[PDB]
Write a protein that binds this ligand. Structure first.
Ligand SMILES: O=C(O)[C@H]1O[C@@H](Oc2ccc([N+](=O)[O-])cc2[N+](=O)[O-])[C@H](F)[C@@H](O)[C@@H]1O
Ligand SMILES: O=C(O)[C@H]1O[C@@H](Oc2ccc([N+](=O)[O-])cc2[N+](=O)[O-])[C@H](F)[C@@H](O)[C@@H]1O
Ligand SMILES: O=[N+]([O-])c1ccc(O)c([N+](=O)[O-])c1
Ligand SMILES: *[C@H]1O[C@H](C(=O)O)[C@@H](O)[C@H](O)[C@H]1F
Length: 466
């Protein structure tokens, strides 16, 4: 028998706004070594991005951003024509790669085909300030001011002290030294160069200090988040992924603090289910779809202005997998992002769960969409309990439900949303839609264990609208 829970929506309790560019992805800077990947001719990948959002952000950085060197005078053939750069596995220094001018040109075409904006990593770990300045100049010229959201100076500088990029004594102080030096060189060459940071791995203590020290220099504050790791650790399981944890609590507190204290927006610029490249049998499963869609909403509710799920290649946690030669496919995690895409932008509303102690991992978010229609995204992350949700507070005669499903939580395939898989180049239309009738704002929705749902409610009295 289902666990019977209440969801009270309060349309008068307004929360944060979800902007049209909330969604996004993160990729390794090393991907720039192959100009055919982010390219106008890569119509398949662009299609997958357009389905994730009419607007969104592509972030390029990661562990490889310390090992990639802009070379304005490269032979075009320096390029690795075949490279599909998967998430860095974080065991040792990445292979050193050059970025060519044509890679930047093709990145511009790709952004033009997708309608997305760009966050671009610069090499503060091993590069010089002069080369960063030159790189920045070419990117700004090529990408354009309209599409370049920010440069970022180093990736996860809070781990430099332990990974060898710096000595064991490197700390916030020294980073702020490094950052200032690069910033000044870049701005001399590119007066309108925009910035974000500190792009930290986990260390929230760097956030307010960074935001305070560089308040007039940056557009937003950034940090990262991984639910689990390392992948070889047997405690890192699907069930664990469905649950909050102290790191998430700390990141969430960290983002609220920086926004409260400084008034600067926050963006989660690198995130996925398990670090060091993800975990087989967890990161590549239907559970990751529930995990990722729920994370997008939880972060927005806390005040995050956007997100970037890391990926690339055929990485265990990649939302999109593939290569320009063999084609691209949506992995299970993509479908959690797709639910969010389908819900769209708007303003979050009060929505409280009650009688839910026997179904503690169910989450729900109500949104007043741009078009004025109410949506509710639910994630029954309970692996073993079906739920029956008594929804109230919804001023609508009826809704449709689109289901996020797979036959088992650990399935690496068989994932559908709205009764359909995603096809080639991000193609997707709902094929199964269930009507839910309401009265006095009350609706009842059953959800199987380990499933999700998006409810879209009809306007009142709008049957004759043009
Ligand atoms: O030189 C090595 O192989 C060195 O690699 C360290 O690993 C890293 C170095 C740099 C980065 N990074 O810029 O992101 C990341 C890693 N990493 O996450 O593995 C090793 F820690 C060190 O033992 C090794 O000597
Ligand atoms: O790690 C290294 O290879 C070495 O690289 C230098 O930085 C560069 C390498 C290559 C180019 N380029 O192909 O135009 C440019 C730079 N650069 O001016 O940043 C570092 F300076 C050096 O410390 C590092 O050991
Ligand atoms: O269940 N449906 O496919 C469906 C379609 C259009 C609709 O307008 C509604 N509705 O009124 O909520 C439901
Ligand atoms: C963010 O963390 C990722 C991971 O550990 O999976 C890496 O792939 C990425 O290079 C790093 F920036």
């Amino acid at each position: 028998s289902p666990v019977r829970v209440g969801l009270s929506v309060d349309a008068s309790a307004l929360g944060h706004t979800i902007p049209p560019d909330y969604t996004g992805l993160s990729y390794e800077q090393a991907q720039m070594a192959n100009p055919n990947y982010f390219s106008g001719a890569n119509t398949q990948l662009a299609g997958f991005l357009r389905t994730l959002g009419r607007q969104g952000v592509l972030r390029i950085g990661g562990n490889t951003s310390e090992y990639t060197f802009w070379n304005r005078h490269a032979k075009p053939t320096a390029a690795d024509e075949h490279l599909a750069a998967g998430p860095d596995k974080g065991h040792h220094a990445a292979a050193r790669e050059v970025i060519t001018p044509e890679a930047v040109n093709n990145l511009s075409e790709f952004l033009d085909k997708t309608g997305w904006k760009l966050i671009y990593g610069l090499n503060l770990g091993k590069g010089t300030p002069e080369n960063a300045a030159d790189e920045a100049a070419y990117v700004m010229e090529t990408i354009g001011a309209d599409r370049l959201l920010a440069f970022q100076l180093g990736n996860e500088p809070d781990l430099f002290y332990r990974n060898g990029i710096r000595p064991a004594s490197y700390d916030f102080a020294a980073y702020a030294g490094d950052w200032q030096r690069f910033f000044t060189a870049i701005r001399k060459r590119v007066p309108n160069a925009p910035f974000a940071g500190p792009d930290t791995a986990y260390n929230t203590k760097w956030l307010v200090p960074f935001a305070d020290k560089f308040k007039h220099d940056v557009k937003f504050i950034s940090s990262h988040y991984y639910a689990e790791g390392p992948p070889t650790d047997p405690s890192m399981t699907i069930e664990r992924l469905m649950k909050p944890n102290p790191r998430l609590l700390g990141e969430t507190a960290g983002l609220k603090q920086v926004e409260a204290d400084t008034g600067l927006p926050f963006r989660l610029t690198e995130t996925n289910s398990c670090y060091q490249g993800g975990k087989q049998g967890v990161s590549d499963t239907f559970a990751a779809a529930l995990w990722a869609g729920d994370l997008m909403y939880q972060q927005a509710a806390a005040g995050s202005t956007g997100i970037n799920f890391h990926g690339g290649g055929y990485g265990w946690y990649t939302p999109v997998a593939g290569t320009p030669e063999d084609g691209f496919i949506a992995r299970p995690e993509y479908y959690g992002m797709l639910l969010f895409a389908q819900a769209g932008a708007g303003q979050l509303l009060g929505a409280k769960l009650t009688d839910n102690s026997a179904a503690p991992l169910l989450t729900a978010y109500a949104l007043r969409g741009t078009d004025g229609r109410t949506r509710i995204a639910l994630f029954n992350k309970n692996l073993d309990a079906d739920v029956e949700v008594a929804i109230s507070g919804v001023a609508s005669p009826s809704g449709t439900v689109l289901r996020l499903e797979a036959p088992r939580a650990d399935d690496t395939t068989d994932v559908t949303f709205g009764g359909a898989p995603v096809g080639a180049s991000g193609s997707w239309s709902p094929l199964v839609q269930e009507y839910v009738p309401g009265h006095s704002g009350q609706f009842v929705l059953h959800m199987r264990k380990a499933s999700g749902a998006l409810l879209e409610f009809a306007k009142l009295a709008a049957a004759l609208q043009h």
